[PDB]
Amino acid sequence: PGTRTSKLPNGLTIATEYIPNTSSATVGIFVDAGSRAENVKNNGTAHFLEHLAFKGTQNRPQQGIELEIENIGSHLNAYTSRENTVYYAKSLQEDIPKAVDILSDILTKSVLDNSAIERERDVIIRESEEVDKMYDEVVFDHLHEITYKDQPLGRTILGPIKNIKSITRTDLKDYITKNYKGDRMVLAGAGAVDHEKLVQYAQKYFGHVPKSESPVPLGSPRGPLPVFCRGERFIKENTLPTTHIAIALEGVSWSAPDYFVALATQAIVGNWDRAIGTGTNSPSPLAVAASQNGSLANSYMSFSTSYADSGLWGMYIVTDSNEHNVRLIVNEILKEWKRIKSGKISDAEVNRAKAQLKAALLLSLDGSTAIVEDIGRQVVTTGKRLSPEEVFEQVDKITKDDIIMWANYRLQNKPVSMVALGNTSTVPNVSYIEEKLNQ
Amino acid sequence: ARTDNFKLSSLANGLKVATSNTPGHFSALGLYIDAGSRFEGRNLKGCTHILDRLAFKSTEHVEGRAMAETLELLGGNYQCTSSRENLMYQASVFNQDVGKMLQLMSETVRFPKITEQELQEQKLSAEYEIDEVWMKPELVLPELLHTAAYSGETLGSPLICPRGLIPSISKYYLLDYRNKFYTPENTVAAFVGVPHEKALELTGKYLGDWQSTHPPITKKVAQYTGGESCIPPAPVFGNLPELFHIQIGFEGLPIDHPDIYALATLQTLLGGGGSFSAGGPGKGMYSRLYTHVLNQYYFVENCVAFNHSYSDSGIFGISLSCIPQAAPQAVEVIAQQMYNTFANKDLRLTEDEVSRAKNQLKSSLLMNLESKLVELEDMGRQVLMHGRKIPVNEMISKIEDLKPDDISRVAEMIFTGNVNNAGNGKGRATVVMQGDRGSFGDVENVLKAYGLGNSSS
Ligand SMILES: [Zn+2]
Known part of the structure; x- marks a missing residue:
């Protein structure tokens, strides 16, 4: 057992x-x-x-x-x-x-x-x-x-x-x-x-x-911890119909104590697609704004990537190269992160996020293949395997407060790096993002 | 039956309750209804699909929004889908949530509200779905195949609803369909990782007092006819290559037919796929269709064996996609492969071929069964169809005992048009294709030239 x-x-x-x-x-x-x-x-x-x-x-x-x-x-x-x-x-x-x-x-x-x-x-x-x-x-x-x-x-x-x-x-x-x-x-x-x-x-x-x-x-630590470098790379390509933007801040590693909290916060912001919606019965204020007055983008996707000694957490955005002012959708995303930092989030959306996370992490461990995948990656990058029940527990105990804390630590006065590909003319600067975010 | 920890019983109202496996990290459950496009006739065309798209909306005791939100809080891992012979509501959930999920399922299955607004939404949306479906060859060809194999009846009644029939799908017809098929005696409640005792409690609690409407019995046996059909070439896009498609099949076997394992082995032995085939060893590159077709002709971008097996009939055959230039050769290429499975004394099925096909069949069945959801669905449908779940050991044994002659005997039976199912089908081939009809040549003549099919009753 x-x-x-x-x-x-x-x-x-x-x-x-x-x-x-x-x-x-x-x-x-x-x-x-x-x-x-x-x-x-x-x-x-x-x-x-x-x-x-x-x-x-x-x-x-x-x-x-x-x-x-x-x-x-x-x-x-x-x-x-x-x-x-x-x-x-x-x-x-x-x-x-x-x-x-x-x-x-x-x-x-x-x-x-x-x-x-x-x-x-x-x-x-x-x-x-x-x-x-x-x-x-x-x-x-x-x-x-x-x-x-x-x-x-x-x-x-x-x-x-x-x-x-x-x-x-x-x-x-x-x-x-x-x-x-x-x-x-x-x-x-x-x-x-x-x-x-x-x-x-x-x-x-x-x-x-x-x-x-x-x-x-x-x-155990490979050696010197990777270091998150703030920066930006605008890749101008005016032939592309859609423009692609990724905004990141230093995230969480596989063994971080706050690992699940980071994933919970990712789920609270979630994703959105101009045609499909959010995949949720009730859309966040961000999703609503995104879809309003013609649409601010084609889609956005929250992401959190982890490594044994580091992690990246952020937003991936896809816009129409000719129709969207990237700046407008970036504003909304920062506003949403600030909403969390300010604590203005319901018990309901926290519970929804925890439920989504639990499902994503646990109901997916179905065949021997997915299970081997979890055993192998966890042990090889961490030295141990948290059991499905242990993982359930780690998510179940998350509080609205844990989340607000985590956002204030990770999304306030922290460096951000960004990459944009396509119609770069409308994409805001990295110091612009930090200014609005920390503001 | 035994190692399965499979248990089955019925409620007083006829609802069967099936459980299997032991406790695990989480559970799975579903409600299975013996309904599907094959039962719609002409009067209820498209009702199955609209009802499944209506699953989990508002009910008599649960508002729409609440239903949605509670399902999210349960993990959101649920779905309702339907096909030609099935209509099912399934989900996987954490162990402590089985009862709540069963309650929601029984609500949408017993007390759906189907408001004007909910119906109008699904209809509007169905039109868009149908328009998109007609652009995907992987979906269209099989649809044309079935329609022609049974001349538009039962298993050949359109699975894709005619676009123009969607607007006339009224609540009245949806109620008529529900009053004919949504009955406890036509339903199965299945669970994986839930003790049988608990399952009986929860089932009786939510479905126990459900009563039959005692509707007129309207289930016709499938009558295979065979036939031909061809639709115009697809539109030529950008860098994408232009391909013609053809599917040639003969009546196959019912899923519980004694030679079904032999037939599945034949299918595996033929195998096939796309000329690309991404993946490491084990994908089945030593199957005849790869060896004798894909590797030999590249004007062929896809060649695969298909085996649609249903309750009372099936369609077995080969699918081929090629450049318009090669179209004239398609029929013969396929005919040769079918012929070579039994009528070619120099290309008889070898011990190695059969042994490998056998193992690959055992393998895909057992591996697919590693998933709870798959164990669940397989159990529900089996019980729905013959009220019993065949134990794994038995399935494996029946396959391991297959011998080349078994596979050869079945190949000949199928390609010779000598299957005798309840519907007493013709021995005529089903040939369906997309491209310029002329480009395929005298199709019936080539098939006869190869001794395939059957012309005298
Ligand atoms: Zn590679």
């Missing part, structure tokens, strides 16, 4: 949650790594590895991995975030071990054939051009760049085209060697899974992994 944990001699943590009445499961290997482990010349490597992991190992050629997973009905997937590298598998309970085997094989015994490494350069470029068509992604990548100026968190995951063209097999093996340590990874499982047996298999297939020479517990 709950999440069982075991540590391997090399430092690798095994976290598990058994799900009664199931005959399938998910197992994933999470590594404290991702793009934040790269440097300016290194940038883009972790993602490159992600792609090559399915190309062949010292034990299985590409088509051997594919055909092997498909004959038993399993699934193999991977992704790279700024914080982690994750490979995971879904399979019938009978195949859990074969699963662990393949995951280890792919993560640590990958061939990294030079031919493959070259053919892939083009695939990554194509991928890069596709993201360039997702304006929200573009804005947030730029936001990270200026907010975390010249820091690890400030680099994108794909990396610059320049690097996508210069990454060498040496870079790849170096990244592997430097980052793949037992004390820096978590093998998470859920569904029809025996914790004891999975630990054995972990030892068997992942035991050969090097320990760091300076082991630190999964949730």
Whole structure:
């Protein structure tokens, strides 16, 4: 009942949650790594590895991995975030071990054939051009760049085209060697899974992994805390029909005591879309203003992003490049944040926000896959897994006061960074925003 | 039945109550009504959709606003949807909130108010929805497929309401539909993670005194006819490529038919998809449609096997999208694949093919069932249809015991037009397409040229 944990001699943590009445499961290997482990010349490597992991190992050629997973009905997937590298598998309970085997094989015994490494350069470029068509992604990548100026968190995951063209097999093996340590990874499982047996298999297939020479517990400070840099980047592009704006202030990290309060406040402001509304029976004053007299924008979305040692919290706005004066919708958003800071919020909207949050965090932990996702990310970035019941409790206890406090600390006399893409002429300055906000 | 912790019983008014699984992090519950577009006839066309769009609005004992707000406070994880054979109200909620959610559901199911204003809103909005639906090929083709497979009756009665029929959907017709289908004896209350005892308490408390209206029985068996139809080419946008589409199918099997697992295996063995197919290993790239079609012809941007299985009939076949230039080849490409499943002595279904298809089928069923909401819906519909929930063990076994000949036998039965369902269907193929009709050639001639279908009764 709950999440069982075991540590391997090399430092690798095994976290598990058994799900009664199931005959399938998910197992994933999470590594404290991702793009934040790269440097300016290194940038883009972790993602490159992600792609090559399915190309062949010292034990299985590409088509051997594919055909092997498909004959038993399993699934193999991977992704790279700024914080982690994750490979995971879904399979019938009978195949859990074969699963662990393949995951280890792919993560640590990958061939990294030079031919493959070259053919892939083009695939990554194509991928890069596709993201360039997702304006929200573009804005947030730029936001990270200026907010975390010249820091690890400030680099994108794909990396610059320049690097996508210069990454060498040496870079790849170096990244592997430097980052793949037992004390820096978590093998998470859920569904029809025996914790004891999975630990054995972990030892068997992942035991050969090097320990760091300076082991630190999964949730301990990497080193110097990232620092939030105030700034602005206006990216003029008059061909775009819509303009995109992201406004952020330093947020909360995964382990912050006020983490849930930050999410609760995000839910209190919420989202809005010119056509769809708020997704709520009763709209905030912001949503109402947004929709009035012709509309002030096309949509807005509150966001809160967390990392182990930092976080960003703010608003993403999309406007009509020809019809909207961005300044007007920004005014309303700041007014809404000030409404919260001033305490003018009902018990009802606080309760609504807490209910929304609880649901978003808990009713979504449905399959073994979503659960493994929660186990793995929590342990690998925090050192522990707060249980669904613990999380419920953390949200349930939030008060109107906690929220007012949090907004006054985070949204008063604090630095803000901003990025705008499109018809930039109507977008207000960062010092303008701080002036109105702190005012 | 057993490991399921599945329990079933009925209230005096005939309402079945089904529970399964054990306590967990939260619960799921829903009300299932044996209704759907296949029961509308011509008189109640579009009533199913409007009622589901009307779900959870004001009721006799709960104002609209209060209903909305209480549902938000419950987490907002609820929905009402309907299809050809279903109409369901479902939600997942925290354990302590089951009773309150059941109450709200029974309110909207038993005492909806349906004010002039609420109805006018859903109607206005339905017109916009219909206009949008007709622009999506993934939705239109299957609609044309069903309409032609049953000549516009029962399973082929339009799932997408004719736009011009929306304005005449009156409260009177909505009441007529409710008085025919919303009866305790035509309903199932299901719960996942709720003790059977508690479920019976809550159910009797909110639905126990509900009484039948004893309406005229109007449920016709589906009669497969087969048929052809073609709609004009879609408008050419910007950088998007122009594609023609064709779907070719034959009557399939009822979901509880003995060879259904064999048939699902055939579907998995054929597999297919889009020429893009994003995702890591396990996606099914070693399925015949990928191997013999997608990888061979790229003038083909999509090729997949479909298996619509309902209570008394089904449609099994292959879907293909291609560049206008290749249209002339579509029919034959599809016919060949169907033929190669049983009539080609040199392309017989292999042990490897069948073994892999089998495992992938077991896999997707079991994995989908990891979700409470899915366990819930599957349980509700099964009980609604034959008052019993097949245990997992049984399902797995029946699949593991399949052998190549099983799959080959079923393939031949289907593509030969030799299925004998209650509706006693024709062995005629259903061919539906979008593009210039001429571009597809003599369709019936190619299918006959391949021994597909059946011409003599
Ligand atoms: Zn990629």
